RNA sequence: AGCUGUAAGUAAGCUAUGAUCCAGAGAUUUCCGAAUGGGGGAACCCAAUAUCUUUUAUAGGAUAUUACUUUUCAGUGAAUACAUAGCUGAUUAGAGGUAGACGCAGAGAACUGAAACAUCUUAGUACCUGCAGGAAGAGAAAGAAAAUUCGAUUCCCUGAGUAGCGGCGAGCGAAACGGGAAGAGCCCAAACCAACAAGCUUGCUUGUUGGGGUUGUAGGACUCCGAUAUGGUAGUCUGUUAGUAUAGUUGAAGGAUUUGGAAAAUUCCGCUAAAGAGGGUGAAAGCCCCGUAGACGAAAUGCUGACAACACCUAGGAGGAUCCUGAGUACGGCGGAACACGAGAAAUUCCGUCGGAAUCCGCGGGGACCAUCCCGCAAGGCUAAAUACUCCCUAGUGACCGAUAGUGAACCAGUACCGUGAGGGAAAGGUGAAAAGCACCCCGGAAGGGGAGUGAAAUAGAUCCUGAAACCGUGUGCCUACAACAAGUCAAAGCUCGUUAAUGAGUGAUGGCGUGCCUUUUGUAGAAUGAACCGGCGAGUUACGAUUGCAUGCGAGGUUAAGUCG
RNA sequence: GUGUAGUGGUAGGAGAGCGUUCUAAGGGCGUUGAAGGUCGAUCGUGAGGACGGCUGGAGCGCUUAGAAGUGAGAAUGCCGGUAUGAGUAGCGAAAGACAGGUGAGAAUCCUGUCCACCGUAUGACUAAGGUUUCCUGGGGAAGGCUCGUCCGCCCAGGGUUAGUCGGGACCUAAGCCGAGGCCGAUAGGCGUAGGCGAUGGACAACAGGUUGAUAUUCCUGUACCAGUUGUUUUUGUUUGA
RNA sequence: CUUCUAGUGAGAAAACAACUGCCCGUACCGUAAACCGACACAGGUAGUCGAGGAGAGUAUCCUAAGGUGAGCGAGCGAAC
RNA sequence: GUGAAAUUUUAGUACCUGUGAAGAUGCAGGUUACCCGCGACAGGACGGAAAGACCCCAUGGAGCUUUACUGUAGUUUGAU
């Protein structure tokens, strides 16, 4: 998975190159994860309890993890995350000159 | 680090004090069902006895036990005295299922071939029933042989389509030798020796224990001396270790440009590999993701080794006076079966009935029977491996299928449905990358539709990828109301066009000529026979033998098989 | 080159070729559009092959060799779809008319009036058998031999009360099962004791009212059967209790 | 069920009062559109009740209580 | 208003005397005939439904008879 709920992210593929954001929800069990301002979709909502009207809304849609990097925050780039045996947990450890997340 | 199945939704919550999830050990398990207290139309009803409960008590509630048969033991018992049925109580084990497979037996067909059919074959097969095991059955020579011998059993190659059998017809069909896989041998009865019991014949007979002994070069008992060792295991659920099966952990290297909605595509310039097998991501990735090559890992449970400890088993030499060496057995007649062998000149092996041997100077066999010779010792048991199968689990592979194929069944299928019953048995997969699954207006009761929107694409709108043919429609360029047309082809005026650019395309007034297609038949338009039309499936193949042509490698030579490493 | 010669044909023999799927190596094409579909006035002696226009949107060609579930117009073939007959035959015995409702819509639904049919039954109660069809409120896509606002249809909610009634906690007939037992290649066959088995025997409740649906069940009133407790009246278990 | 003895074997009758009484079936159709016949079918379905006038009568004709008007019609008024 | 069926090689489906597998809508030579329907009849399409029930064959079946062949359940007789 290598991606948690709150974890900034770069997008590599799919009409949102280079655009970053914050992961909101994590769906493992189908490998989908939704971010902010990357997958805007227009929903023809019908008049409902919520939103008595029927506006055209704009929310985000899931993206497959093969389109998502992780972030440095110590530095600010993308790292093909590796794992290290730091003290008795496995804290993710960046590649590309040794960061610690 | 998210979670409360399929499955949208809302309400309720859980979770870094480590959920949900994975793996190993445990706990609870309603009612029927061999069904087992009795009864029964299965998933129901009604009991007995003890203990404890609710109400003043009656009814009500829960717990435990109570079937049949046999194997051991007590008691009771009595036609009949003594004790034997019997009864009572306690105790031991059984009883049903199947993996539609493999094994061993009991019982056991017809169509079919013989161009008919009686002996024969199809066949000791199909089906029924009993009895098991992870394998079973066979197994330690009364053998095979025939000089010169070999020494348990099973399985495979070759012997060989040979010797044989057969209304000598259709057909059935071995075995030893030789080459290989795996190897392995043990335990009793008897004669004798002791202790206990009985008849104590007080003769020594019976019995039970324990000891002694297991064979063809005949062995043992029995007598006499040595030793009292030396080698073994096909036993333990006893420990100690090592490995492995069931959850896992780690795991290398990329950017930019052009087309796109989206790059893994294209063009530059880089990097990694004990890792270029595979699967996935908005099209086709060695460098995004899951992985692969490597390296590490078990608290619990199971298996397999190894060595410990315990259990069990096993001794020489010499003598030959007497004793032992499996009885209604071997074998004979009779009637049937089994051996390739159908009574045949018929040995060998079984079954039913009757007759009935010897005891080592003895017995069986060498395909009727006799003689010499040679090889063995039946009428008592046990025994791993090499062999056959796959309901099930794990990991893989395929010049195997791709929704009329492949299982009957890719989907909630042995279901829907049919038959009282046993039983018979279908059709049905595909939106897009992501539901973003069409807010809002308009006609319309609704269904349905038209704009506007989502979308790269709505002729991808839920009957949802592509979307052929029969069949049903709309528009139009050319012809048709004096005409007898297997429906065409050859000839041809006019009218409208303008192509893969060439002695062009469409239609067609009028003339010439002309009795469909298939099969079967001496002969077809036949009034002989088949097709309603379109689509899909739907027929000389494979294994083992034999023979001839072509070709290739060696040639008076050719050539391996089973089997072992791979 | 050039001469000579031959070239109908069923059963059948011989020879050479076209095309489909897959495997192997080499070389290729593809979002700047592959397979598949449609149209075209093109090429070779044949089976057959190219090229271009439109649709369509993810994989396929070419060469050499190999292996086959390799070629379809007929089996009164098998499966699906659609025709002809044809808007034809039929619409499954029996009498309706009007007014007003209801509603987008009416001969076919509701209401009213007159008429008419059966009446040892086309009326009332029960045993089988069916298995929620019963009642209340909604709906009109499919069933209804037409129509349909309606329904035995679809959706949602809700209805079946027992000491006395029928059966069990009672008895047995035909029949069946049958501890022991008697027979039989296995399987099993038959049967004693004992049981199971209503169509039969035996046995304690009547009238009226109540709902949208239940009524010897609910309610009212008057009873009955068999038992249990509490104060209310005769003693040797011998048995005169 | 009624009796009689063999029989284990305090002292039970009846006052009245007050209580206890288990499981299963109960809707609906039932000479029918709800069962048996593939059907909303001119067939089949055991038992009880089953009225009036005449009339021997459950026969026949019209009728009471009670139920039904049947699931395609409107025209014309030829052959057959 | 609703709405089938058996059948069906494609059909622009005339009459006579011939001819022919020996009785023709379709061949030959002649005669009659404008195109499309609607209600009736049943001469023909060797008309439709049942791959002849009559007859022969298959070295085909099945059921039955007997002094056809071969056997056998059953009844009886003798030895043991």
TrEMBL record:
GO biological process: translation
A Pfam family assignment: KOW
Taxonomic path: Bacteria, Bacillati, Bacillota, Bacilli, Lactobacillales
Protein species of origin: Enterococcus faecalis
Domain KOW stretches: 2-29
Protein name: Large ribosomal subunit protein uL24
Keywords: Ribonucleoprotein, Ribosomal protein, RNA-binding, rRNA-binding
Coiled coil: none
Assembly information from the UniProt record: Part of the 50S ribosomal subunit.
Gene3D superfamilies xref list: 2.30.30.30
Record's keyword annotation contains Cell cycle: no
UniProt KW Methyltransferase keyword: no
Family: Belongs to the universal ribosomal protein uL24 family.
GO terms, molecular function: rRNA binding; structural constituent of ribosome
Encoding gene, per UniProt annotation: rplX
InterPro entries hit by this protein: KOW, Rib_uL2_dom2, Ribosomal_uL24, Ribosomal_uL24_C, Ribosomal_uL24_CS, Ribosomal_uL24_KOW, Translation_prot_SH3-like_sf
Alphabetical list of PROSITE patterns matching this protein: RIBOSOMAL_L24
Functional note: One of the proteins that surrounds the polypeptide exit tunnel on the outside of the subunit.
GO CC, one annotated term: ribonucleoprotein complex
